[PDB]
């Protein structure tokens, strides 16, 4: 591994020096200088929100595109000898196309709740308004990464169902049950995404 | 007063320049010659 | 009440309860469902009996969903910092242990349905290991409920 | 006329920038 | 004095996030190696 | 983790090699070939399977030898199609499979070189899978194998010839020993390379290479009883590759008897219950008719693993079992000797 | 009415990420499937103009990011609000990372597809349909970028 | 009383006691679970006797579950900083030692049940090494308990 | 009106990154395809001046970065506003990294194309059509770098 | 008395004395435990004679256990920062030396058990080398003692 | 008028990186192509004075870095403006890393060019032509380094 | 950088010098261009140190 040795070197050297920087803030007196309050409060509630709106659609279609080429290479690979696959097994493509639909539906839902304000002070920007920033961030992560992971899930089982169908045509209906359980993880993300932002209201 | 600026102008350049320096120096440190002849 | 930045960690507790348990449920269904389509060519008889390792990983997702609904409904504006750390430590306890239960179901469930296709005596032993692999996620559930409800 | 332009241009510039590197290599 | 005052600390958290995207897109491109022979 | 990649470069070639698996003749296909009475009728029965119309242009008298090479020329152009499309996790892997045929072509090439004959031996009498149609210096070498060994290092078998002194192959070592020492160093180099590749292609392939080394361990120490090769010779003919390495290879070097290789095979419960071939019984499957069925059993379990390179090496070793079976069917039919026609290996 | 002095940073970074990450995916779609053209062109030289449809659909991925990069660059102004510029950063990631992923999926399926079409032409009416599904993912990131930038 | 962020380390103790024991017990169940399927194709008699690596790895998870519950019931708003580091240090203690015991059980459990298929005399020795790998989690338990009562 | 003292950093980083990343793209287009020219030449040496089209199409990627780097360096003044330098930083990254991507796609298609062209001359009409599509990725990055440098 | 953050480093001394020694004892058990199964196929008589290297790695675990309890009994609310640093260095000195000693035991325990399966004369020499691998943790123990007494 | 006390750090890093990275590019251009000289010359000793053109084209890349390292080292003064020092830093990266790219490109196509020239000398008139287009990448970085150090 | 160039060319150059003595005129000619990289680094280190 050559390129992995860079990321394994950056991740070690970054933390390693966090540790020495972590035992030198406490050891003098300088823990007052750390201020996770000043990090979460001073910066913006637009940065957390608009990243989560961006991460909702983009990370979902990352796993949606990921799920296609795992089984789409399996469609054309097994389809050379057995061309009867191509029409029956496109439902595995749609099962990793629904996870992009769950992304873009939640993306236009989360984008509608963002509204500009005028305040610039952490006390003037109230805790109703900073919670509006963090909830759009966490909703974007729980619909972005969840549709990513279930995008790989229905793609991997979709690739295996594409290859058993080349051997025996009577098998694909039974293996299609597994992709239903794999696609249920995508709907589980959209449930939490609309529950984290049900009570929220951004604006002033 | 410009301490946030000057600290990162040195830091992200220097570890951005040293990361280029180790990646290059690696690639040339081993380069797979045709050494039999 | 609580400070403005307090609501951040409870949202991360609601997210990481669902994100990491999604990664467990994804690996538990993909790695095991790879083995289902593989064994089905030589023995299509267990093609409906061996769908139970992919549903043991499905309960790992619903372990993460229950604590997600618990935290996202108990979340409110101006919660204390003590309550938000409890919900942050709740979601890390269930999602990252469901990640462990997701990996343990997938590795065993893939290997179990290969040995069951080679010898059907393993099926009474395979479901016993999948019990032990799933209760890793169940222990993460009951520690999340004892942390968030304080 | 064609080849004596391009080939003798190598002889000029390798003397021309070469003389600076020749001078510097006496250090 | 402020090692990170908020604005550089927003621009760094934006850039070092999408540098994880760029080095991911580059790592996929750096491995699309060609074939050896033809027929 | 090693499974959500490997469809980037090798996704098309996995479904292609598994589509070729469905054309391997099943038990029902082998029953139709047994009931034939003439090789002309065997040609029409093979038209129902994937092979169809491959013997259309040959002749009116259909000899069994033209059935043999036409069967082996079909699996070559199936394999040569796959090696042209593997980029480089798999092209070097597919090159490792052809080294087993490059060894058998090299030792075939050094024998006529010692007896002063050249290229006319090479083209008709070499295996097309490990072939010499490139590196043209090896074809123009008519020198007596000392100025040709310096050419032979220009060939991807050069990494295996580091235990091969050039003078030692010049009639000082026996010609069969120079095969099994080459196949020894080929096996550890192929075992180490499949260990560098991680994940699914490390536990779907090294179980096959463990038994292949122990086929090489057992058959050497049984067929080296009457002949004047020392025990230190067959100890260095053993591949340090498999289950018998630290313990069993020492006991096979001391055997001197068929009964002593049997009791050291009873220490391993997988390698015992294979030594019941029992040729003292007049008609039965012999020891190597039981080693073949355990070989194709491990290749059949390679297809149960999904995201791995071992599907390719198993496919060649099962398509080679087809060309062994159909020839054995056709040689029992042409000789009209179908009392042992059931002694084939039913893979699928 | 006036914002901070660093407010315009996130919008132009969304103008850059909309074009860079789309062109990174379109380069993977052109190079990986373009490698598959040379492998099929030796044996089957009839399908050469037929098989440009993977690299053409990868070219649509680049103009997906080009549209949003122009739309963000025309909405730029000195002293813009912090709300408006962060909208175009989220618009840049929405069309950038979408085109990077959809540019990958067109590349792998297009590389495997033109090698499968050259051995059986029945796959050519199915390979184009899989590429059709992979292309809408770029359009999925497109229309959410149109919502965010014009907001 | 103490500062408000003191409870962050305590819930990090209750979290890391669970997941690191669970990540260890997942490795004990998965790595030994592949060993069950590889041996049972040849020896179908030793499937119910051979499940003891996945059960002894399950005791690692209940080692973490005890300390995770004991810390979570000892939680209060406004705990002192000294009390919070005790539960944080107890959480990493039972967790990472249970994580290490989770690796050791999975390795010797995998190689052990491959050996018992080849010789039944190893079955008395396999439980002896598996006990010695299991007490490492027990050593972490008694020091996590001595930190939580304080 | 007068910008801060550090405002000139981002604009000159836009000038350098527009030239560096476009040269790194044009280097990969020359190096990867130039190895394909030498492997082509030993069997089919008639098509050598015919086959230097992938090495000059990578050359247009280099002059794409050179043009905007002068367009950025002509707009440099001391005391420029922080908004104006952020435009030229986003202008330089959007042409260099897009030129980096377009330099990669020319390097792979140019390598695989000229090797297959020596075994099939029909590929060259198909090869140069893919190379057109791979080269406009730099041109897409060019027109967004210009539209960020006018304002 | 000392500062409030002082007791964090002392309980980090209690944790790192345990989890690093347990990681060492897990490596000595696992790496040598595969050697027992590889020996047992041919020489089942030296099974109980070969439990010694996983016993010698077990003493490494209780080496970190006695100093972890020694630190945890010396804990108090508001200890001095000088005293808390002494227990932190006492914890890292026994764990990381125990991790190295457990690494040294497992390597020679693997090759020595495999080596003595072919020749019984190595067994007197193998247990001599394991003595030198154990005292590395014993040297780290006695400096952890004199750092904890002050 | 008088700049800050830390101002000369960035312009010094432009003087060093213009020489460090350009010599690193000229290192790869000499070493990778010098391997191809000794591999070719065992069978064709006549072409050893004609084949040293890829190692002198890499030598020009070092003089491309040497010139601007002098240009930056003569604009240096105690208390230069922070605008001027960022110019010399952005000048140095745009010639060093571009010369690193041009030096890496010369080394690859110079090595592969002299391997195929040993088998056919008709490649030699084409090898120099690709070596020209690899060498202008350093010249493109040079002429933008001069326009940044002019101001 | 200069030590990398003399390291590689000095490695492969003396491999071909034994098999053919004609390379010795060409091998030391490449080592001229390999060494001046350190020499060019000298005169910029000099011109930075006079100020
Ligand atoms: C300080 C910390 C020090 C400690 C850190 C690390 C210590 C150890 C580091 C050594 C590892 C280096 C990586 C390496 O070896 O190169 C690799 C690739 O390299 C590339 O392909 C180039 C990648 C460019 C990265 C440029 C970073 C600049 C960031 C600037 C940011 C500015 C942003 C502005 C935009 C090797 O090449 P390969 O051929 O792929 O080998 C693979 C072989 N294999 C295929 C068999 C697996
Ligand atoms: C080892 C690690 C030791 C460092 C962590 C110390 C944190 C707890 C210390 C503490 O007491 O809190 C202090 C802050 O302490 C900090 O805020 C430090 C945070 C810096 C970064 C920590 C990263 C650790 C990475 C780990 C790398 C592992 C990665 C491996 C994979 C609080 O101090 P205080 O209470 O405000 O001061 C007394 C004030 N009073 C009197 C009002 C009470
Ligand atoms: C990796 C090695 C390279 C690392 C290099 C970093 C060295 C940078 C030197 C900067 C020190 C400046 C300084 O503040 O002095 C400090 C000395 O603190 C030290 O000097 C401790 C040195 C820290 C190195 C840690 C490695 C030791 C590992 C084992 C004194 O700080 P102060 O004056 O006490 O201010 C606090 C006053 N207050 C407590 C009242 C708030
Ligand atoms: C995990 C998943 C994510 C969770 C991550 C969580 C990261 C950390 C969560 C900490 C919770 C917030 C505490 C805080 O900042 O509030 C207060 C304490 O601020 C201080 O100054 C005290 C010391 C700094 C923070 C110490 C935290 C140590 C945790 C580090 C360990 C890291 C180890 C990780 C490995 C702010 O001070 P204040 O009194 O409110 O000032 C207001 C008064 N004023 C208005 C007048 C200015
Ligand atoms: C990994 C890379 C690590 C990079 C880490 C980088 C950390 C960066 C720390 C910067 C700290 C603040 C900057 C600053 O303003 O301080 C000073 C700027 O002085 C400088 O700019 C120094 C920068 C030189 C660093 C280069 C070292 C690399 C050499 C490596 C080669 C070794 C090879 C050996 C083998 C100015 O001081 P002041 O306080 O602002 O002035 C006010 C005071 N007064 C009013 C009294 C005048
Ligand atoms: C390998 C091993 C390497 C490990 C090396 C480790 C070297 C670090 C040791 C330095 C600590 C000693 C300094 C000191 O005296 O205390 C200081 C602690 O302040 C700091 O810790 C300085 C660094 C903080 C921010 C740097 C982030 C690093 C991220 C980089 C990630 C890159 C990852 C890329 C890969 C106190 O300073 P101060 O009192 O706050 O005064 C500041 C001025 N002010 C008042 C204006 C704010
Ligand atoms: C990893 C981050 C490493 C940087 C650590 C650090 O220096 O903390 C820095 C902030 O940084 C934070 O507030 C901590 C936020 C961590 C989030 C990381 C994502 C604290 O360093 P500082 O410059 O002293 O903070 C500004 C001072 N002030 C808060 C009084 C205004
Ligand atoms: C290598 C790159 C080197 C990069 C080095 C980082 C250099 C940052 C320091 C320069 C300006 C800092 C600054 O003033 O912050 C300003 C914003 O500035 C930003 O927004 C910084 C954003 C950094 C992005 C760099 C582009 C990389 C893109 C890569 C993408 C790849 C795909 C805001 O100023 P302020 O702090 O809010 O004002 C407080 C006043 N005070 C400062 C007097 C206190
Ligand atoms: C101030 C910015 C400093 C950081 C600049 C970042 C630009 C670095 C660019 C990449 C240089 C990498 C060179 C590695 C050559 C790869 C070898 C090869 O491809 O064969």
Automatic annotation (TrEMBL), chain D:
Which superkingdom, per the lineage? Eukaryota
Localization of this protein:
Cytoplasmic vesicle, Clathrin-coated vesicle membrane; Cytoplasmic vesicle, Secretory vesicle, Synaptic vesicle membrane; Melanosome
Q: Which family does it belong to?
A: Belongs to the V-ATPase 116 kDa subunit family.
Q: What quaternary arrangement does the UniProt entry report?
A: V-ATPase is a heteromultimeric enzyme made up of two complexes: the ATP-hydrolytic V1 complex and the proton translocation V0 complex. The V1 complex consists of three catalytic AB heterodimers that form a heterohexamer, three peripheral stalks each consisting of EG heterodimers, one central rotor including subunits D and F, and the regulatory subunits C and H. The proton translocation complex V0 consists of the proton transport subunit a, a ring of proteolipid subunits c9c'', rotary subunit d, subunits e and f, and the accessory subunits ATP6AP1/Ac45 and ATP6AP2/PRR. Interacts with SPAAR.
Query: What's the stated role of this polypeptide?
Result: Essential component of the vacuolar proton pump (V-ATPase), a multimeric enzyme that catalyzes the translocation of protons across the membranes. Required for assembly and activity of the V-ATPase.
Protein name as it appears in the record: V-type proton ATPase subunit a
Q: Please state which portion of the whole protein this structure contains, as first and last residue out of the total length.
A: 739 to 765 of 863
